[PDB]
Design a binder for this molecule. Structure first.
Ligand code: HEM
Ligand code: HEM
Ligand code: HEM
Lengths: 679, 323, 682
């Protein structure tokens, strides 16, 4: 049980009498009044203590990544990695360390939709026996900017316009694309966000990245450059934009519910932790500077070496106390790891510690149960708001004769202390500049675009076409085109069509045809279809419901989550047509006999909106899902102009339909149904 | 200009050089580094002051009605109402008073959709020459509960489940309908929220209500029981649920954009302020108790008397500082 | 161990390596720099996490009673008091309840002197098994004002002037006496503060009062009006003002060190909890309204009935986490107690809850270890800044089918819930007025002054003379005289002398000669001299030291704390003359042979200021302390002009001096050394 240490702070209210926050049993359903129909008395201490706590329930949301969700788990190391790092949690084969991970979007506030197009956070805390170690990462290996002093500029430009606070959780407005084109370093992460990484199917179907180059340090001080990677054991999967838009309204909690259900049903998701290891003398050997967070290291130059696996198998008990209150920091570093001179990483170390003072209104946020380490805290810090401990050592200073030298200093040689990499040097003038090695903003965006499948490339262009069409300012649109043309003339030409602007002349300075592995989503089938959802469209009339039940029973044998849909909640029905939508499912199958609700009077009922069964099947097909119909239900496919000839469409007997749908779920999205420019 | 008093705190940065918050011109696009590819210096005061302010931008959202939008305007009285109230802002015909109004949902957090099904807030401030007077009302004339000590129970049950924080901005979960059926007083507002009032076309197409019976008092102390009413001059209009759902995803800012667009285009919305006036000795004479906020007074028993009109004609300059 | 429950949050750093606040061993004595003589790096996470916690150590001081100190202890009930209250902690003989008590002044800020003249706080928390019960009291039985809405006005006027923040922890300025004379209800507490109650010898030598009339309620709902009393087992004792002033500079921690020393040495102080009980139908039967907080009930009308005793025997381990962070509330009420319509108490209930939001900045301050009850918290409260628990019940609302009705309602008949006194009613118009029964502002101030000894009365008049002479506005001083004249014409006349104002004519509307017991300090000797301090003046020359240590050993047998003073820290010396002052002792005895440092060569030394040994003996005598000299040390008494057989002066051999000094410590202050108005006449 990963949450084991949290047991001593859990409060059970079962069978208990109601109390105030200072003890004493009470009733609190009536205000104390002066007479039968009289005013409430100020001396009603019960009312005021109950309502004061309600009035003060909220804390400020995270300044970025406000919308998110998390879970507990365990990390297991695959070996003794002391030859590359002194980190204790990586220091023995099969060694286990509790973790908590929080996934998120970036721009939207609390309560914005999960399926907005955005970069996604992927923050992992290791509760190691030598302190808390956080990998505060994203699902995209590169970031928008090269210097941390520019973060407020990027965030202000993406977040809503400060006059009317429009739009929510979206980059599709003038200020964001004014910034992207004025700060060309942002074009790389932009392309990733316009790809499937911007609209992932679920938290469980994302890779993770530390982005920054860090250092792993051995006991003697020898260091290697390192990139952190999380490889999902569930496979990467993404939606299409027109689907994520509807899903944002039909279920804003799509991703957090997906993670909760997977853990509750015993289908805990897993990620393997992997690293790219680079010698210090190769920091600028691969066509870019590894101190530059706008570039990633192609796996051809350095393969992914997996060190262990992380599995998230415990949901939180109280969302606010655990998920909302947890405070990640890249400064949460342990012996065996060190920073690099990444100018973006450097400023993060200040911002995360400082921002906790705003979110928690005090300096003792590390004493909260979700932030406490398991390894023990011994220093001379005292007081502060909400001080929860009582310190025994009255000689709270060092050096000191009276405290006998305790707590004692720890360094590289005594006490397993943290230490900066011994060989790191400073040389040159104090400057407010960036290295000229950071100047290429176009090569790797082109490299990323080259490494996607044709339809995958079309998704990227259709995302840019959608977003840039929201820009009202003509010159900003031209600025965007001019910057896109430096990455690829064909991309700029194809985007220019939607904008009604002229196809610009090629600027080939950064054009190239190189490709790299591991960045595409749609070029690989899923390794498992467990937890994937199948919507079964049925009806309470006839014998459709009994066949749907048998269909459901066989689908569930393969680990699928099956929802039978009918007009009302008859026996065996999981959801009404009124509450159903294709966005909730990964496959849509029509049960035999249910074709009666796709035309005629069966399609016109007060129990659901007109055309809802046909809308669900139409949505599921046009969004690239596997769609099916059993037996006579092929009339439902015919009613929407779909033939069994097509890939991802299945008809016939029940067994043939189950096999076809289960194979189609590995493909997940059938890209044959999406038109490409000039096809 | 309704916002005329706010101009003295407005800051124009056009044609100016970047500064810190304590003055002095600066550049803030490069951190100070010790060497060409070196670490950032703690002495970079420029970086830390700019990033500290960013790190501390957020304040707690409202515990309820966190999602909303507002605008400035003018309230104009239709008469000298001194025979029913001593309130200065109603003391003369054509008397004008600046206002600010915020419309909102209730359950959803800051970034939730405008077209979620919910009770809607309708909060009005009159900046009168005898103090600020607020009518903090809703677009529905009755409330769920009869005693304020039960408010945390209602809100907890409607807001997301505390284990996973699901669902956002929705009453369609177990805990809400547990409370509705366990506290039957909630059924009246429930029915209003399940009607078109729960999914209005826009803020401009809602009526407003103070819900509570208040008192109007004259200079010598004669009192009347009063219900506040806002009557939209744009007409009441609502969506249908299957449409509001898609709109929640296609444009979560549908209502705040609608209000902003109407004001910017010169189509300022208006509401008439109307009242029902009841004698003190008839507080229990209309088939219910007028101290009960789960009941409204049918207009057949007491028709509306209109006191004036309010027009919202100025959008805010900074949403955070104002709205 | 009253602190037993706090052991689970105690952190022991001995034998450990330094860590950050998120774990991991570190060194934190050098900043990370870019080069040997280079700038500090932003990536020094160790420096910033250490200095951030330092930068944010302070929390707002209490808006009033900012200066004070406290301790843990145990309260023991003397019987089963279910016949008068359903309160659990009073429900059985020898039933024990942990307590924390904080004593304080009122006006001064965090670092002000203990021995300023002020009302003194006396706040007790009972950690009962049915919730925390707080008696937030003072060492004076009446308060300045009659309605809580006037509290900001009283406090603003007593606290420093808002333009320069002068004076600290003092009522001797214009605005304070402008308010006392403009709001005549303040005159009763004024007189108490101008007496010995304003300058007590220690926290342990104070009585305590809940001030307000409260209600005791039995299981069946029967109620009685009640006044809370704390009666010190150490006896009441006070200083003189000219002594308190010097002590304010010589040791600003005099009272908190006294309490700490007494507990550390095994001399835990004790108070008895006593009540006055009044029938509901007699609330206005004793010459005043018992809802009026400016009045106390004379013990002749209702005697004190002891219910138990409280003993404070454990010092805090961390002052901040315990004493500074503890949050008292009169709203901390339990089953068996109820409020009254005392308009001062009524507003307190709102203010103490609200003010914690400023001091603790978050609604979860009751989760702090020192504020937590021992009885268990079960409700549907959630979230809030700094939420320290993880609630299991996901159906956090009532009523509810899903949570099976739990946590469940508790009332008078079910679950031993709190219930308001069932017989209380409201009747009349909603009003912003005060009951005319509150109108008398002068009778009881006169009763209090009538009940002090003659020299005790002179201390009150001399305190007023000192304070009012600081008032610069002429009219305010005249306004003060007119108000004083309504209490006592002779008081106004003796005060008028110091102010150079004419003796006002009698205004006998409220004059009377009644007296009452239990309000005087100097008319009763102390029941014990334990912990009382003796300063033995000695010297390092000759054999004075060896005799001074024999004197110390005998004195210590009787429970006294003895300080042997000499020119330097020789063997057997506790304190140097440079570090010594008479304010730190209750008696001063010159050891035989030490007369050499009172005159001539031995009195002129670079090791202490000029005349220091003579000044200690002079201060000790002039401030009314028992003073003594052994054998040849009688020369020291003669050098300052003190006759060897005055009252409280003891000369002779060692055994005689010990005998006389211990007897004089019971008298404590020798009042015939203070001139009374009319003594200097011819
Ligand atoms: C490679 C670059 C970055 C990555 C991978 C990243 C990732 C993240 C993630 C995942 C979170 C959410 C943590 C959670 O779930 O609670 C977060 C929050 C945050 N980030 Fe970043 N971010 C980056 C750049 C920056 C920069 C440059 C700054 C400022 C200089 C910054 C400031 C913040 C702040 C203040 C928070 C709020 C944390 C809190 O309130 O607990 N980030 N970031
Ligand atoms: C007739 C019943 C009620 C109406 C019409 C109503 C209406 C409103 C409205 C419109 C707002 C948002 C104002 C804005 O736009 O900023 C609001 C906020 C709020 N309401 Fe209510 N509400 C009602 C019941 C209650 C009750 C019973 C309580 C508590 C006892 C309560 C506590 C609050 C609080 C704490 C806020 C937050 C305001 C802020 O943070 O500034 N409400 N209410
Ligand atoms: C009989 C009248 C009063 C008595 C006996 C009394 C006593 C006390 C005491 C002993 C304390 C300090 C508690 C501690 O040691 O921490 C205190 C604090 C305080 N008092 Fe009073 N007081 C009285 C009148 C009032 C009134 C009328 C108000 C306001 C309407 C008030 C407001 C406060 C506040 C705000 C604090 C700060 C508490 C905190 O910050 O924790 N007091 N009082």
């Amino acid at each position: 049980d990963a949450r084991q240490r949290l047991k001593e702070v859990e409060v059970d209210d079962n069978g208990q009498f109601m109390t105030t926050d200072f003890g004493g049993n009470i009733e609190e359903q009536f205000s104390l009044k002066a007479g039968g129909r009289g005013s409430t008395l100020l001396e009603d201490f019960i009312f005021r203590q109950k309502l004061q706590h309600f009035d003060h329930e909220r804390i400020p949301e995270r300044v970025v990544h406000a919308r998110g969700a998390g879970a507990h788990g365990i990390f297991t190391s695959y070996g003794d990695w002391s030859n590359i790092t002194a980190a204790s949690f990586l220091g023995a084969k099969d060694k286990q360390t509790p973790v908590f991970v929080r996934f998120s979007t970036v721009a939207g506030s609390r309560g914005s939709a999960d399926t907005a197009r955005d970069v996604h956070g992927f923050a992992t805390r290791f509760y190691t026996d030598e302190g808390n170690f956080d990998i505060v990462g994203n699902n995209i290996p590169v970031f928008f900017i090269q210097d941390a002093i520019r973060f407020p500029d990027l965030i202000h430009s993406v977040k809503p316009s400060p006059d009317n606070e429009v739009p929510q959780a979206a980059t599709a407005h003038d200020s964001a694309w004014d910034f992207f084109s004025s700060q060309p370093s942002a074009l790389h992460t932009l392309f990733w966000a316009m790809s499937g990484n911007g609209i992932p199917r679920s938290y469980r179907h994302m890779d993770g990245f530390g982005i920054h180059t860090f250092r792993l340090v051995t006991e003697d001080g020898k260091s290697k450059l390192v990139k952190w990677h999380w490889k999902t054991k569930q496979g990467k999967a993404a939606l299409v934009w027109e689907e994520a838009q509807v899903l944002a309204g039909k279920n804003a909690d799509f991703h957090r519910q997906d993670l909760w259900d997977a853990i509750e049903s015993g289908n805990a998701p897993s990620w393997e932790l992997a690293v790219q290891l680079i010698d210090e003398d190769k920091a600028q050997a691969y066509g870019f500077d590894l101190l530059d967070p706008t570039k990633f290291l192609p796996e051809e130059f350095a393969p992914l070496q997996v060190l262990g696996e992380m599995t998230l198998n415990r949901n939180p008990m109280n969302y606010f106390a655990e998920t909302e209150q947890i405070s990640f920091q890249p400064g949460h570093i342990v012996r065996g790891v060190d920073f690099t001179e990444d100018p973006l990483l450097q400023g993060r170390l200040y911002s995360y510690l400082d921002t906790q003072l705003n979110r928690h209104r005090g300096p003792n946020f590390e004493q909260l149960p979700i932030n406490r380490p398991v390894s023990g805290v011994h220093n001379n810090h005292r007081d502060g708001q909400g001080q929860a401990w009582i310190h025994k050592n009255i000689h709270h200073y060092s050096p000191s004769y009276l405290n006998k030298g305790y707590p004692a200093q720890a360094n590289q040689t005594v006490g397993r202390g943290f230490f900066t990499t011994p060989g790191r040097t400073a040389s040159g003038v104090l400057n407010r500049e960036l290295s000229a090695t950071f100047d290429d903003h176009y090569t790797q965006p082109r490299l990323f675009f080259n490494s996607l499948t044709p339809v995958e490339q079309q998704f990227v262009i259709n995302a840019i076409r959608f977003e840039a069409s929201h820009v009202t300012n003509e010159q900003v649109k031209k600025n965007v085109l001019e910057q896109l043309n430096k990455i690829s003339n064909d991309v700029a030409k194809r985007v220019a069509v939607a904008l009604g602007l002229e196809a610009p002349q090629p600027d080939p300075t950064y054009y190239h045809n190189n490709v790299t592995r591991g960045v595409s989503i749609f070029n690989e089938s899923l390794p498992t279809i467990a937890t994937l959802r199948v919507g079964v469209l049925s009806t309470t009339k006839g014998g459709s419901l009994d066949k749907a039940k048998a269909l459901k029973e066989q689908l569930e044998k393969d680990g699928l989550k099956v929802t039978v849909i009918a007009e009302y909640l008859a026996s065996g029905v999981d959801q009404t047509y009124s509450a159903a939508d294709a966005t909730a499912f990964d496959a849509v199958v029509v049960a035999e006999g249910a074709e009666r609700v796709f035309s005629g009077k069966g399609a016109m009922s007060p129990l659901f909106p007109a055309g809802r069964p046909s809308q669900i099947l139409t949505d599921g097909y046009r969004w690239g899902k596997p769609v099916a119909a059993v037996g006579s239900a092929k009339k439902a496919l015919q009613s929407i102009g779909v033939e069994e000839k097509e890939a991802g469409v299945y008809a016939g007997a029940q067994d043939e339909v189950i096999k076809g749908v289960e194979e189609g779920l590995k493909v997940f999205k059938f890209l044959e149904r999406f038109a490409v420019d000039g096809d």
